[PDB]
Automatic annotation (TrEMBL):
Keywords for this protein: Electron transport, Heme, Iron, Metal-binding, Transport
Gene Ontology molecular function: any one: metal ion binding
Protein species of origin: Geobacter sulfurreducens
Record: residues binding heme c 1: 1, 17, 20, 27, 30-31, 51, 54-55, 68-69
Protein name: PpcA
Keyword Translocase among record annotations: no
Length: 71
C-alpha cells in the first residue's frame, strides 16, 4: 500500500510507513487498537501521542512545525 498524506491546511503531512515499520518494530503501538482510532485522529492526537508525542518520547522523528508540514 501507499504512504498517506494528511491534508493539513498549513501544509501537507507525509506519513512514511517503511520508516515506522523499521523504527517501531512493536507494531501494536499503532495496529490492533480498539475501534474508534480512525474517527479519533485529528490535530490534538497528531500533536500529541498520535505523531509528535511519540517522536519526543523516542528521541527521534520530526518535532518542529516545518519538519512535518510542507507545502
Ligand atoms: C504507526 C506509527 C505505525 C506503526 C508503528 C506500524 N504501522 Fe503499519 N501502518 C500504519 C498506517 C497508518 C498504515 C496505512 C498507511 C500507510 O502509510 O501505509 C499502515 C499500513 C500497514 C500495512 C499495509 C502496508 C502495505 O501493504 O504496504 C501493513 C502490512 C502494516 N502496516 C504492518 C505493520 C507492521 C508488521 C508493523 C510493525 C513492524 C507496523 N505496520 C508498524 C501505521 C503503523
Ligand atoms: C511511535 C509510536 C510513532 C508514532 C505514533 C509516529 N511516529 Fe513518526 N517516527 C517514529 C520514529 C521512532 C521515527 C524515526 C525513524 C527514522 O528512521 O528516522 C519516525 C520518523 C518519522 C518521519 C521521518 C522518516 C524519515 O525517513 O526520516 C516522519 C516524516 C514521521 N515520523 C511522521 C509521523 C507522522 C506524520 C505520524 C502521525 C501520523 C507519526 N510519524 C507517528 C515514531 C513514531
Ligand atoms: C508531526 C510530528 C507534526 C508536528 C511536529 C507538527 N504538526 Fe501540525 N499537524 C500534524 C498532523 C498530522 C496534522 C493533521 C491532523 C489531522 O486531522 O489529520 C496537523 C494539524 C495541524 C493544524 C490544523 C490543520 C488543519 O486542520 O487543516 C495546524 C494549524 C498545525 N498542525 C500547525 C502546526 C504547528 C504550528 C506546528 C509547530 C508548532 C505543528 N503543527 C507541528 C503533524 C505535525
Ligand atoms: C492509533 C495510532 C497510534 C496513536 C494512538 O495511540 O492513538 C495512530 C498513529 C497514526 C494514526 C493514523 C494516521 C493516518 C490516518 C489519519 C486519519 O485521520 C485516521 C486514520 C489513520 C490511518 C490514523 C489511524 C490511527 O489513529 C493511527 C494509526
Amino acid at each position: 500500500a501507499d504512504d498517506i498524506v494528511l491534508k493539513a491546511k498549513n501544509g501537507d503531512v507525509k506519513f512514511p510507513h517503511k520508516a515506522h515499520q523499521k523504527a517501531v518494530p512493536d507494531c501494536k503501538k499503532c495496529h490492533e487498537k480498539g475501534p474508534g482510532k480512525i474517527e479519533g485522529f485529528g490535530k490534538e492526537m497528531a500533536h500529541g501521542k498520535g505523531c509528535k508525542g511519540c517522536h519526543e518520547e523516542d528521541k527521534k522523528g520530526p518535532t518542529k512545525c516545518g519538519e512535518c508540514h510542507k507545502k
